[PDB]
Tab-separated table of C-alpha atoms and ligand atoms in Angstrom:
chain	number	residue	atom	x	y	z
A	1	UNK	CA	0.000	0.000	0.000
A	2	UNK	CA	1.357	3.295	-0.861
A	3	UNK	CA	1.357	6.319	1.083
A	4	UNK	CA	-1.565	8.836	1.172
A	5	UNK	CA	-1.457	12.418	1.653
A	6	UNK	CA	-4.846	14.521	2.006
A	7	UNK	CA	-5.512	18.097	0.452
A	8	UNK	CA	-8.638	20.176	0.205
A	9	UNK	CA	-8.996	21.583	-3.252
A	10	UNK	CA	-12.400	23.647	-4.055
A	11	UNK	CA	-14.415	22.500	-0.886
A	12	UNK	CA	-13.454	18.688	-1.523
A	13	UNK	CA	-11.012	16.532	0.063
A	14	UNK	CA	-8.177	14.772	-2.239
A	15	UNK	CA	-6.651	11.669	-0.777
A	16	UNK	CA	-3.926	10.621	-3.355
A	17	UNK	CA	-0.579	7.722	-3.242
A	18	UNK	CA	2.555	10.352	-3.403
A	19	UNK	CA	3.206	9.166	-6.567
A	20	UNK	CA	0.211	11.746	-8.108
A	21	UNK	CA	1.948	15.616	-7.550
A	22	UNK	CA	0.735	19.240	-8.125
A	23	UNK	CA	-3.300	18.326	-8.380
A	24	UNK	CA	-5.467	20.931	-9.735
A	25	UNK	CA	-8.649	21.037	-10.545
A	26	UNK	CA	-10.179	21.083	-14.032
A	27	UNK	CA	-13.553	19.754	-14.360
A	28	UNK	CA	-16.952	19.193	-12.281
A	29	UNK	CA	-20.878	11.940	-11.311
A	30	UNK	CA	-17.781	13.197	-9.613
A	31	UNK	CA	-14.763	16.247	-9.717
A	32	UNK	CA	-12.095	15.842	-12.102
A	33	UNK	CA	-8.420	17.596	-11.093
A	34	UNK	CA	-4.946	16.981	-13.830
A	35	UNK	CA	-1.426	15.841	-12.150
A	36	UNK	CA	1.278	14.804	-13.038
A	37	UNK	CA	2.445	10.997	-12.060
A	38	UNK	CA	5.864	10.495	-11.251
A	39	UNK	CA	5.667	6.753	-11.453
A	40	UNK	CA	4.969	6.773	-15.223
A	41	UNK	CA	5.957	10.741	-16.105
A	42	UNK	CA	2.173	11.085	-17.457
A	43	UNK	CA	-0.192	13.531	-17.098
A	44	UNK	CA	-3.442	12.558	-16.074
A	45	UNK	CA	-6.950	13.196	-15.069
A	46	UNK	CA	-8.077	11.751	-11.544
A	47	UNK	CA	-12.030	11.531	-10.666
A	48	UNK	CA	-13.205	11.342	-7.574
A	49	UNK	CA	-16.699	9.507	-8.165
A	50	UNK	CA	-19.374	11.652	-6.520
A	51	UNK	CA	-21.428	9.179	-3.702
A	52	UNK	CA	-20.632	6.253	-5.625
A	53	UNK	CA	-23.083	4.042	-3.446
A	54	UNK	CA	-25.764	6.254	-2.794
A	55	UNK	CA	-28.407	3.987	-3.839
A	56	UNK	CA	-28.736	0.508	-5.814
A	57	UNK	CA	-28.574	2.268	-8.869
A	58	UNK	CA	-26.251	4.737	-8.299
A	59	UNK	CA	-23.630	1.576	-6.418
A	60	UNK	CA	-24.592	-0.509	-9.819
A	61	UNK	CA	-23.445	2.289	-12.322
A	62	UNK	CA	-20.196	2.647	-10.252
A	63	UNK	CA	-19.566	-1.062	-10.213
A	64	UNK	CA	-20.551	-1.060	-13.929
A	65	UNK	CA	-18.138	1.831	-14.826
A	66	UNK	CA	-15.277	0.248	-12.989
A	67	UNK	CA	-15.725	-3.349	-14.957
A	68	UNK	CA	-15.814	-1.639	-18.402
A	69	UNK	CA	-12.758	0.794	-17.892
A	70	UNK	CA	-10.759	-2.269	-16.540
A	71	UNK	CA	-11.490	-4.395	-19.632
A	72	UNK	CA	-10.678	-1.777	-22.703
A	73	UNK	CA	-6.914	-2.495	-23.585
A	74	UNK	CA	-7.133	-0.634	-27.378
A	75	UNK	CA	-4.777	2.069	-28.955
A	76	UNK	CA	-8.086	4.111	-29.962
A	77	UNK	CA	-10.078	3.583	-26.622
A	78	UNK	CA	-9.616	5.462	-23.440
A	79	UNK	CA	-7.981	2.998	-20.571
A	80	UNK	CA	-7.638	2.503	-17.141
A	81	UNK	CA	-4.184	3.640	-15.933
A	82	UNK	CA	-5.201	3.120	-11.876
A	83	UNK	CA	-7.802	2.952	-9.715
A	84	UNK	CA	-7.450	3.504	-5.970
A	85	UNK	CA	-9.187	4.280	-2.286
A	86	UNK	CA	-7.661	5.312	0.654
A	87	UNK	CA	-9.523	2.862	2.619
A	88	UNK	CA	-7.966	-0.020	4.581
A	89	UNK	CA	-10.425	-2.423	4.770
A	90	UNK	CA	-14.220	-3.190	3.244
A	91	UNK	CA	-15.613	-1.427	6.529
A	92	UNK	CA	-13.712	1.399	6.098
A	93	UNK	CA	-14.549	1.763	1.535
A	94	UNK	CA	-16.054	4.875	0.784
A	95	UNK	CA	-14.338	6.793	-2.305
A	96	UNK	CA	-13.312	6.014	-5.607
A	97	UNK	CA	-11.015	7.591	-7.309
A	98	UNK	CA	-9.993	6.711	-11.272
A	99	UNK	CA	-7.067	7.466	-13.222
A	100	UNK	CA	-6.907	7.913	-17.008
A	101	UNK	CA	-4.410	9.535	-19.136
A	102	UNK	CA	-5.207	13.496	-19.911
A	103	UNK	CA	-6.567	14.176	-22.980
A	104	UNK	CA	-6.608	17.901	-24.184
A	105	UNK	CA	-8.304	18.799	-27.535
A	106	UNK	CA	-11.685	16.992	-28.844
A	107	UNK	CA	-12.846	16.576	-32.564
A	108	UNK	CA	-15.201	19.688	-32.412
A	109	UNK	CA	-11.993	21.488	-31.173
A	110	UNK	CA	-10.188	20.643	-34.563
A	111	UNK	CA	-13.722	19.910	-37.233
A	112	UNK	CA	-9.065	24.188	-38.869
A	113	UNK	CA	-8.835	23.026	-42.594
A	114	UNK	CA	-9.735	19.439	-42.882
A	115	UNK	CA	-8.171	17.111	-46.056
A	116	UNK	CA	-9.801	14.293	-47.282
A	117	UNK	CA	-7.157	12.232	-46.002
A	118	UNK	CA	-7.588	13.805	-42.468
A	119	UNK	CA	-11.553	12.735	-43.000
A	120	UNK	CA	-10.060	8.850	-43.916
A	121	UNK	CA	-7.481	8.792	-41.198
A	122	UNK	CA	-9.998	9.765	-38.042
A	123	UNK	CA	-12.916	7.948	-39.647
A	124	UNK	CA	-10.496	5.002	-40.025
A	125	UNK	CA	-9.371	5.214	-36.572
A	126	UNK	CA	-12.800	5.475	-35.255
A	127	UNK	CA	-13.956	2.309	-36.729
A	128	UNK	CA	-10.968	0.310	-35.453
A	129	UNK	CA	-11.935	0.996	-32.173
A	130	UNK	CA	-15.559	0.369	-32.878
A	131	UNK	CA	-14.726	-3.328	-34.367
A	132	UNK	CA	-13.032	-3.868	-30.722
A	133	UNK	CA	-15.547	-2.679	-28.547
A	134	UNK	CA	-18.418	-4.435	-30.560
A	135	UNK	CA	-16.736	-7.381	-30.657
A	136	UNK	CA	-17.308	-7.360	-26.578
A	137	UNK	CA	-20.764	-7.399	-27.250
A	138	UNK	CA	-20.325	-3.688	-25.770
A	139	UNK	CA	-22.926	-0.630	-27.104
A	140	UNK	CA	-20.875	2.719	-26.736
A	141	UNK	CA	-24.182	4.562	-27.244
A	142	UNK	CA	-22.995	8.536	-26.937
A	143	UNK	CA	-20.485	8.555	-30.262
A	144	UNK	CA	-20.539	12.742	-31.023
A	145	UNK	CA	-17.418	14.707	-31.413
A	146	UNK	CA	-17.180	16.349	-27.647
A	147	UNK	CA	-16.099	12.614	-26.979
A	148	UNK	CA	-13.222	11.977	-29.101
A	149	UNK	CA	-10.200	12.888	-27.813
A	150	UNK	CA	-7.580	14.043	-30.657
A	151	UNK	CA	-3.890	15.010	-30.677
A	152	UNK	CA	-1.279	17.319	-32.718
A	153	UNK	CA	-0.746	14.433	-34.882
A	154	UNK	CA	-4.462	13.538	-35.526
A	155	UNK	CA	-4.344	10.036	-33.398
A	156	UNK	CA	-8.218	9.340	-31.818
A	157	UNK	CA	-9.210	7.652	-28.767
A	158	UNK	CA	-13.087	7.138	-27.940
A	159	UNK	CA	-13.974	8.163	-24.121
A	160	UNK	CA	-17.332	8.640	-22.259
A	161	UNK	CA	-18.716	5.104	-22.565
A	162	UNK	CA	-22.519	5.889	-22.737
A	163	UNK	CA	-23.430	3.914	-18.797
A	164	UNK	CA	-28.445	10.716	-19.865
A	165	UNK	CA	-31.858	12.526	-18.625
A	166	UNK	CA	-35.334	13.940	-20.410
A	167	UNK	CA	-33.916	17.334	-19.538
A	168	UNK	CA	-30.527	16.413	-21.154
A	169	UNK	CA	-32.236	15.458	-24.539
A	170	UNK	CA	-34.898	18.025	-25.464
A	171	UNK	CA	-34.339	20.675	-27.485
A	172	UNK	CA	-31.565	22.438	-29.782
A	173	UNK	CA	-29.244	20.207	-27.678
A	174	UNK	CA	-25.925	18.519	-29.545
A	175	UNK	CA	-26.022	15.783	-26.916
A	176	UNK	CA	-28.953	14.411	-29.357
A	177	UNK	CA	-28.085	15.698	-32.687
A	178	UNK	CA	-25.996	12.283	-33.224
A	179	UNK	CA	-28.575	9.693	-31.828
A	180	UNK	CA	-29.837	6.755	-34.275
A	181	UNK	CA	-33.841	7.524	-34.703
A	182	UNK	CA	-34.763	3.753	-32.957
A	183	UNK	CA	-33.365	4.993	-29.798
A	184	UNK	CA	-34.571	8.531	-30.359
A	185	UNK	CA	-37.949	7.781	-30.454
A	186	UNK	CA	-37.867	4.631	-28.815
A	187	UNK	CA	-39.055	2.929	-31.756
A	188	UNK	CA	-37.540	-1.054	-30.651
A	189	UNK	CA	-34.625	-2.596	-28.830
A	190	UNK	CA	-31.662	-1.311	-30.401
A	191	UNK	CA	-28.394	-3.262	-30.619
A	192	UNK	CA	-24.811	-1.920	-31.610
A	193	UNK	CA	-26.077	-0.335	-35.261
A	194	UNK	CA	-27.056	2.994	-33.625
A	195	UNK	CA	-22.932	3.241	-33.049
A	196	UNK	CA	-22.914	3.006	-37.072
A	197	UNK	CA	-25.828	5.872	-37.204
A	198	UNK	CA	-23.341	7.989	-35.266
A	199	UNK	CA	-20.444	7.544	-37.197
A	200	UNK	CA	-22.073	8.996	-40.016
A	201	UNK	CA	-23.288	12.284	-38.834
A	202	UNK	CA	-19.821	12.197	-37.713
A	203	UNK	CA	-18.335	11.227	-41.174
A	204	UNK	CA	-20.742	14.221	-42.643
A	205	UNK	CA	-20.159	16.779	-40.471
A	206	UNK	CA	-16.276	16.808	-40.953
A	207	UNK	CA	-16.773	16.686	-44.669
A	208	UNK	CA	-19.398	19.427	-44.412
A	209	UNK	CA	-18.083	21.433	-41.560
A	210	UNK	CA	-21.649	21.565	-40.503
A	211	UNK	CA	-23.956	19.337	-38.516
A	212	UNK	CA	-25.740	16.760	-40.226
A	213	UNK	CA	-29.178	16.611	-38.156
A	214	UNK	CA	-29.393	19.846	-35.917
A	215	UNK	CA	-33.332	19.706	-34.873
A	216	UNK	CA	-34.866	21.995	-32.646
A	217	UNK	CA	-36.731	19.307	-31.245
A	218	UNK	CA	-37.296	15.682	-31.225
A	219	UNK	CA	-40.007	15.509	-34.256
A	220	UNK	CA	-37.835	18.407	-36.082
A	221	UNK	CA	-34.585	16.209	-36.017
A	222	UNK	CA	-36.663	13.042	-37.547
A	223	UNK	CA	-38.512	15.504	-40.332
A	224	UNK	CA	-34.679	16.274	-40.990
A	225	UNK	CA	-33.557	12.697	-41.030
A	226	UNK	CA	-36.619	11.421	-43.505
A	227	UNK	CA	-35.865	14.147	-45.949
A	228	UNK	CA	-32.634	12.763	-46.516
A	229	UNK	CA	-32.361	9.043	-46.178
A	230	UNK	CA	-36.581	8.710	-47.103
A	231	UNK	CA	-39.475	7.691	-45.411
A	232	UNK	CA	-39.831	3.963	-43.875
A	233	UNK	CA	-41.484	1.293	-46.089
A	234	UNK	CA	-43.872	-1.368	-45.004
A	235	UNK	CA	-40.792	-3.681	-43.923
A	236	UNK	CA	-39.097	-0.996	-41.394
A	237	UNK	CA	-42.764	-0.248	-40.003
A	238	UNK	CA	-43.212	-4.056	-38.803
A	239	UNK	CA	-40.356	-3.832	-36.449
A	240	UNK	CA	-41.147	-0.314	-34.997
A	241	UNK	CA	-43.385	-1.884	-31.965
A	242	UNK	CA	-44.633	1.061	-30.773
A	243	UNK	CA	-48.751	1.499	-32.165
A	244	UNK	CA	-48.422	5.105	-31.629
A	245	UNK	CA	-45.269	5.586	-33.287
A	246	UNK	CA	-46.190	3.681	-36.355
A	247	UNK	CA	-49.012	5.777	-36.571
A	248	UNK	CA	-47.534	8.579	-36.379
A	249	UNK	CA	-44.761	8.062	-38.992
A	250	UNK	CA	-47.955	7.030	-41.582
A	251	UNK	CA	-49.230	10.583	-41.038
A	252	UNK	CA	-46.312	12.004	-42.901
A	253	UNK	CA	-46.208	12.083	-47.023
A	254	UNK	CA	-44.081	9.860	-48.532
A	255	UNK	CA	-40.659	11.125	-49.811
A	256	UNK	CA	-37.650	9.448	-51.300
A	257	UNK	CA	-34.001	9.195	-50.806
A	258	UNK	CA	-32.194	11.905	-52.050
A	259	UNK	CA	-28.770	11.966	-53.759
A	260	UNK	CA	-26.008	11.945	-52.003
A	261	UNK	CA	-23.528	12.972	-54.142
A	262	UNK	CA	-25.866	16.483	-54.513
A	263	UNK	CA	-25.764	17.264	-51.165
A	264	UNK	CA	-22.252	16.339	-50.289
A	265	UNK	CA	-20.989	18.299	-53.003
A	266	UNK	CA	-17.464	17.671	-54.067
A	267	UNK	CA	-16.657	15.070	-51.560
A	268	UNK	CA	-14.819	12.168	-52.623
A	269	UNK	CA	-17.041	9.429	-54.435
A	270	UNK	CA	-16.006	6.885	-52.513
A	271	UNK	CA	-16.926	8.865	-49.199
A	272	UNK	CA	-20.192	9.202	-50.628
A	273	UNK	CA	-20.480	5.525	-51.419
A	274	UNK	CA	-19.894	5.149	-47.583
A	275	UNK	CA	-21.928	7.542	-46.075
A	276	UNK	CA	-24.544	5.635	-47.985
A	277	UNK	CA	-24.015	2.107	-46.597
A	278	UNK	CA	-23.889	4.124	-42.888
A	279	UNK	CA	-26.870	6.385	-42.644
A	280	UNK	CA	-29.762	3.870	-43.912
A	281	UNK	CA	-32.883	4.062	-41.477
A	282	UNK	CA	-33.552	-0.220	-41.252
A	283	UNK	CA	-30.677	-0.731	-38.339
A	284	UNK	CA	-30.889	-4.573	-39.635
A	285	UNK	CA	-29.734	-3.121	-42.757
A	286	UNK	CA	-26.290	-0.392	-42.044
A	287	UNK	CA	-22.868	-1.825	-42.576
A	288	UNK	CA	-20.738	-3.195	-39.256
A	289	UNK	CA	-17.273	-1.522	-38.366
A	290	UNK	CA	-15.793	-4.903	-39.538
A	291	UNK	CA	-17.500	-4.857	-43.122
A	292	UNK	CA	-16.547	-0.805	-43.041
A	293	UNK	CA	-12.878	-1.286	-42.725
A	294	UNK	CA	-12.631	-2.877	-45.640
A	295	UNK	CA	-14.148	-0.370	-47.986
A	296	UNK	CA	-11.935	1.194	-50.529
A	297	UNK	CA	-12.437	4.341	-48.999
A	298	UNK	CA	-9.591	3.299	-46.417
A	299	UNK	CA	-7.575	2.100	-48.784
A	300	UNK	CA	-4.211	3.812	-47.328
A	301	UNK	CA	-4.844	2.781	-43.780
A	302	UNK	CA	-6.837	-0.296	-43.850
A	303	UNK	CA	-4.195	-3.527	-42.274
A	304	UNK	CA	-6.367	-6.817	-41.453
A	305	UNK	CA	-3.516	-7.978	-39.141
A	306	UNK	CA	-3.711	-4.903	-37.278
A	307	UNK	CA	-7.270	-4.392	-35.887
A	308	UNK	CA	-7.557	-6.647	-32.976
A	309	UNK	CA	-10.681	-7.536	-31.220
A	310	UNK	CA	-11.201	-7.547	-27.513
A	311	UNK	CA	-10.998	-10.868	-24.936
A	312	UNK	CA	-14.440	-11.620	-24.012
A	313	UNK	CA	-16.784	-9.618	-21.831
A	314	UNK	CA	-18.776	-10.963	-18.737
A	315	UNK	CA	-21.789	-8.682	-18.170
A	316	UNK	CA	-24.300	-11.360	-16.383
A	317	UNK	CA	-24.452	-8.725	-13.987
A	318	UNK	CA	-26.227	-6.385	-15.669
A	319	UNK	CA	-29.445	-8.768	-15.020
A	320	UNK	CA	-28.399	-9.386	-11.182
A	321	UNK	CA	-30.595	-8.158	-8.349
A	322	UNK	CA	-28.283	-6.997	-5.865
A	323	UNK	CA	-28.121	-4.905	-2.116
A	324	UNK	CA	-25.931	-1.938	-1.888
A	325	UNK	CA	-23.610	-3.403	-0.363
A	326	UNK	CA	-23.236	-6.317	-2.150
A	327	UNK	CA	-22.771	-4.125	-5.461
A	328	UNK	CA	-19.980	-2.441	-3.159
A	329	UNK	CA	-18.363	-5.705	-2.018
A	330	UNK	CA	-17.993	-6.422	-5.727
A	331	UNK	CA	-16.449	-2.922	-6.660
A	332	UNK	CA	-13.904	-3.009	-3.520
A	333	UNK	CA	-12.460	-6.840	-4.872
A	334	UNK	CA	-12.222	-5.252	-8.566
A	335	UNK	CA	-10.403	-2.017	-6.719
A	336	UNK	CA	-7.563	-4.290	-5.056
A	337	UNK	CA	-7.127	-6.662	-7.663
A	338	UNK	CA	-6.276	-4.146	-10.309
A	339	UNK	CA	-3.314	-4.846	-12.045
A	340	UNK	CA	-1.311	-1.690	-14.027
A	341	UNK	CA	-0.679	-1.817	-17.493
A	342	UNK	CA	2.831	-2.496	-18.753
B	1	LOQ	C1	-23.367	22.558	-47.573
B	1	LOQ	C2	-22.128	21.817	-47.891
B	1	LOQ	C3	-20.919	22.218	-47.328
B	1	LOQ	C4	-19.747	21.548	-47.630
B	1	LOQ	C5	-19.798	20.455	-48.522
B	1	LOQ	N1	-18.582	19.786	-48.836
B	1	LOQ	C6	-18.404	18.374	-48.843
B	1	LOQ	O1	-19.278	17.589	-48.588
B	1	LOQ	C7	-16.972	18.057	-49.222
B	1	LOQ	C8	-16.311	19.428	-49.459
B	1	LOQ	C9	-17.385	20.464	-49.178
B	1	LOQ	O2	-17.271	21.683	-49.217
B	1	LOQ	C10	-21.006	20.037	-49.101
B	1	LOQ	C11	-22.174	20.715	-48.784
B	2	CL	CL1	2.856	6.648	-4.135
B	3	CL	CL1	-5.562	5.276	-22.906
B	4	CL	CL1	-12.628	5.414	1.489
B	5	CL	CL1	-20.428	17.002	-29.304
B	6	CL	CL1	-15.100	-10.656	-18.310
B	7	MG	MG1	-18.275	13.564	-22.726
């Protein structure tokens, strides 16, 4: 066990191993402060999770959050570089604290002067750490550009694992503006395609400059989504399960697909070709990160023997009825058996 020493910084008490030096705070589910780690000469972000086992719901999401960061080991995917808590025993365990490794600028923080082959490279690198996290049978969920971290040399990692309110979603709100229309609207179960819906308002807005789907509202968003990709035919309408929304999207005139190539004027062809494959409104029916990789449009970057998939994924819990502190028994053994990357 290392050896703590305690600080109060804005109204909240730090207790960090020696190791983490000159903490200050940068960001308010928990505070965030940046250090520096003299163990691995990094600079990171700590989080102090805010009442992580409040309630069975709030001690769930905590043990929930701690399982995922532990398992992603990927080049474009945020990882775990230590966890700790001052406590000495399971009677004692209160706090968590998480480290990761600081990111500074985000996509909407460069979407400067964009190439083509900037578009290919992030796109590309996007993917590959799609086809890993999918491959988990993990749903990221909250793709958009305020959560991709990106450096001088244009190398991505994707953070903010999706583990969001009404309030949160309603309105001219960007935290929406990327969201596949099944979970929009609620329309069916949705699987891992709605990470695929995302990358393509991504995709559009960095070709563009501008977003792809910025709706005032719920309904103004999907009027702005049919125009484009067309209305639903009879096959799409038996899988929306909702009466109500069924009947709602009949009370709309019909309109068709428009062409791609006329709206995303002067982009590359085979960009086009992809955006098409991407933004289709039958989730059954959108192309996987896996089949995506391989399009021609990647060309320059594409390696099969470098785009590794993850080790498998235990999330049984997920459908476990638990107490509070049995959910905190469980997050205290993944605490102390943390091992640090290489
Ligand atoms: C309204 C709008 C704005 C920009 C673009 N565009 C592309 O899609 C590639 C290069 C370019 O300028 C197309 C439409
Ligand atoms: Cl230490
Ligand atoms: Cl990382
Ligand atoms: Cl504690
Ligand atoms: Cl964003
Ligand atoms: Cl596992
Ligand atoms: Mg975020």
């Amino acid at each position: 066990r290392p050896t703590f020493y305690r600080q109060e910084l804005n109204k909240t008490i730090w207790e960090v191993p020696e190791r983490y030096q000159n903490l200050s705070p940068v960001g308010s589910y928990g505070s965030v402060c940046a250090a520096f780690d003299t163990k691995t000469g990094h600079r990171v972000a700590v989080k102090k999770l805010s009442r992580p086992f409040q309630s069975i719901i709030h001690a769930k999401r905590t043990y929930r959050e701690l399982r995922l960061l532990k398992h992603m080991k990927h080049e474009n995917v945020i990882g775990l570089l230590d966890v700790f808590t001052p406590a000495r025993s399971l009677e004692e365990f209160n706090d968590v604290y998480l480290v990761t490794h600081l990111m500074g600028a985000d996509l909407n923080n460069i979407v400067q002067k964009l190439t083509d082959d900037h578009v290919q490279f992030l796109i590309y690198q996007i993917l590959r750490g799609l086809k890993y996290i999918h491959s988990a049978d993990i749903i990221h969920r909250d793709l958009k550009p305020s959560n991709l971290a990106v450096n001088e040399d244009c190398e991505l990692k994707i953070l903010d694992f999706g583990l969001h309110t009404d309030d949160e979603m309603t309105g001219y709100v960007a935290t929406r503006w990327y969201r596949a229309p099944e979970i929009m609207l609620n329309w069916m179960h949705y699987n891992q395609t709605v990470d695929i819906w995302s990358v393509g308002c991504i995709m559009a807005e960095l070709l563009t400059g501008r977003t792809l789907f910025p709706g005032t509202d719920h309904i103004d968003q999907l009027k702005l989504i049919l125009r484009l990709v067309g209305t639903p035919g009879a096959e799409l309408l038996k899988k929306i399960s909702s009466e109500s929304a069924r009947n709602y999207i009949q009370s709309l005139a019909q309109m068709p697909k428009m062409n791609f190539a006329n709206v995303f004027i002067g982009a590359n062809p085979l960009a086009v070709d992809l955006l098409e494959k991407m933004l289709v409104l039958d989730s059954d029916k959108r192309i996987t990160a896996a089949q995506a990789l391989a399009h021609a449009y990647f060309a320059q970057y594409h390696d099969p023997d470098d785009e590794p998939v993850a080790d498998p994924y235990d999330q049984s819990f997920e459908s476990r009825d638990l107490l509070i502190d049995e959910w905190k028994s469980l997050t205290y053994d993944e605490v102390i058996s943390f091992v640090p990357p290489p």
